[PDB]
Structure 1
Amino acid sequence: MELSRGASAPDPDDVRPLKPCLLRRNHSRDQHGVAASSLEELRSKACELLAIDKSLTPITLVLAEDGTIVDDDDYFLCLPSNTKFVALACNEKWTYNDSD
């Protein structure tokens, strides 16, 4: 790893340097710090931490601050290493409830 890697050669250092997001399950005001780079990494962590059985999928990760559904993995890695990710295993209450 000593190979000078700060911009040259592929495998950049800014390739999702682990995104410790805070997953939260409705009906339980409890956030969990999970270090995940790509969505796949975060989702899984939310499954073992929130126990999101595979029967509740497709799960819906909506930001508790705004509520934007994050069903992708190229726009949820921007926020700093910390964000309120509300996991909705097709059951937990949504973070909207006509709250416009």
Structure 2
Amino acid sequence: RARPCRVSTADRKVRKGIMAHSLEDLLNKVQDILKLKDKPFSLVLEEDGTIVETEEYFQALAKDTMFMVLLAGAKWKP
């Protein structure tokens, strides 16, 4: 069962809607969906940089939740 995800970039440049079956799968998709040079390593909340690293929390979040991928390196910025 898929899940709607609003994924933004670190520079708040582009926001895109992605259907994700789970966290892993989303992290698989977002690289080629958002034109990313290397695969992101962490999914974070755009609101405050809260780390989403479990499938349960990822599923429990609201459907209008704006995400923010962190690529394979360093952390969130406001």
TM-score where L is the length of structure 1: 0.63
Flag the structure with higher helix content.
Answer: 2
Q: Measure how far apart 1:44 and its partner are.
A: 1.4
> Greater relative contact order: 1 or 2 (C-alpha under 8 angstroms, separation 6 or more)?
2
Q: Which runs of 4+ in 1 moved over 6 A?
A: none
Percent identical? 38
1:89 matches 2:71? yes
Alpha-carbon RMSD: 2.2
Count of residues in correspondence between the two structures: 77
SS at match of 2:16: strand
- Structure 2: which 5+ runs fail to align? none
Partner of 1:69: 51
User: How far, CA to CA, are the matches of 2:49 and 2:12 in structure 1?
Assistant: 17
- Structure 1: which 5+ runs fail to align? 1-16
Give the letter aligned to residue 36 of structure 1: A
